[PDB]
Design a protein around this ligand. Structure first.
Ligand SMILES: O=C(O)CNC(=O)C(=O)O
Ligand SMILES: [Mg+2]
Ligand code: NI
Ligand SMILES: [Zn+2]
Length: 331
């Protein structure tokens, strides 16, 4: 079995290997990359996502989210308070202000220490989940707006034609902005490209050990657990590495820098934080290996998780027994 310790693997494809996305994902899996839940892909030196980032300031962040924490430093939840719209140029200035800027630090490890010590005492503002793309239309390799769609994969694998679309999302981050512990909708893959700015630190639990994380989360968030049998679908809970180590949960960590891709694999729980002003783009995708994960994915039916239009069909076709109850949660 390849990668039996479920370490995060880092790949350096050549320009020739960068042509065929599906084939390279399947290659990475042949080497065991999925066992970690997360992989890094460093693009060939010849590749670029677009020519420059000089003209992005007029993008609108219609609903910036202030991430307010409750709990203790290593075990907290966050809620998202909606703020007034602002442009990317306005947000960048805000991120760089004395109130919100990255503190002085020695290295990524010192910054990680400061994040876990101090996150809860601040409420950073995240421009998340903005439909759109920063890939140049002429970028033919690993262009996250030109991937094969999940609806077409389901149709190729299972023969059923379904409604829905699959488009990318932009994330504009600042110091301390935080992504809570989650897997993807329907336990899909994700791919994330860090277009610019400061790094993003990731934590990940191997898919084969995801239920260990779920059991800890039910212990640590006991009211949330009684409210919903899949409350990590709410994307609000954080647990620190120190706490994970104290409770014996297997995980790994890695820092993504500008110009790098990360792939999350089906049922790979992940969480993380931004180091400073940055912009990422991410999208879900599927492969044939996902289908079985999609069929077994948990679902939130309490009403909190509220998701896209396109998840309807996935539930309806892969999980027809759950469909009725899940749809009640969506309505
Ligand atoms: O970058 C972020 O805030 C969150 N991204 C992801 O969870 C992802 O790409 O799967
Ligand atoms: Mg612009
Ligand atoms: Ni994710
Ligand atoms: Zn729920």
């Amino acid at each position: 079995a390849q990668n039996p310790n479920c370490n995060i693997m880092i790949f350096h494809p050549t320009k020739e290997e960068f042509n065929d996305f599906d084939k390279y994902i399947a290659y990475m899996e042949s080497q065991g990359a999925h066992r970690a839940g997360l992989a890094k892909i460093i693009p060939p030196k010849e590749w670029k996502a677009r020519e420059t980032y000089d003209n992005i300031s007029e993008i609108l962040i219609a609903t910036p989210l202030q991430q307010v924490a409750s709990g203790r430093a290593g075990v907290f939840t966050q809620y998202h308070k909606k703020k007034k719209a602002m442009t990317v140029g306005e947000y960048r200035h805000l991120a760089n202000s004395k109130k919100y800027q990255t503190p002085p630090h020695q290295n990524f490890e010192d910054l990680e220490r400061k994040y876990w010590k101090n996150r809860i005492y601040n409420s950073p503002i995240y421009g998340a989940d903005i439909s759109g793309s920063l890939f140049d239309e002429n970028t033919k390799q690993w262009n996250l707006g030109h991937l094969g769609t999940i609806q077409d994969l389901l149709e190729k694998e299972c023969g059923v034609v379904i409604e829905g679309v699959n488009t990318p999302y932009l994330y504009f981050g600042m110091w301390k902005t935080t992504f809570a512990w989650h897997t993807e909708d329907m336990d899909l893959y994700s791919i994330n490209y860090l277009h610019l700015g400061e790094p993003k630190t990731w934590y990940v639990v191997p898919p084969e050990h995801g239920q260990r994380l779920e059991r800890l989360a039910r212990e640590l968030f006991p009211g949330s657990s009684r409210g919903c049998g899949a409350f990590l679908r709410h994307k609000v809970a954080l647990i620190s590495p120190t706490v994970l180590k104290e409770n014996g949960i297997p995980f790994n960590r890695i820092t993504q820098e500008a110009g790098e891709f990360m792939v999350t694999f089906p049922y790979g729980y992940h969480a993380g934080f931004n180091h400073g002003f940055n912009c990422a783009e991410a999208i879900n995708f599927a492969t044939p290996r996902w289908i079985d994960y999609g069929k077994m994915a948990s679902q939130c039916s309490c009403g909190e998780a509220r998701v896209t239009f396109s998840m309807d069909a996935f539930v309806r076709i892969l999980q027809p027994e759950r469909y009725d109850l899940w749809k009640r949660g969506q309505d």
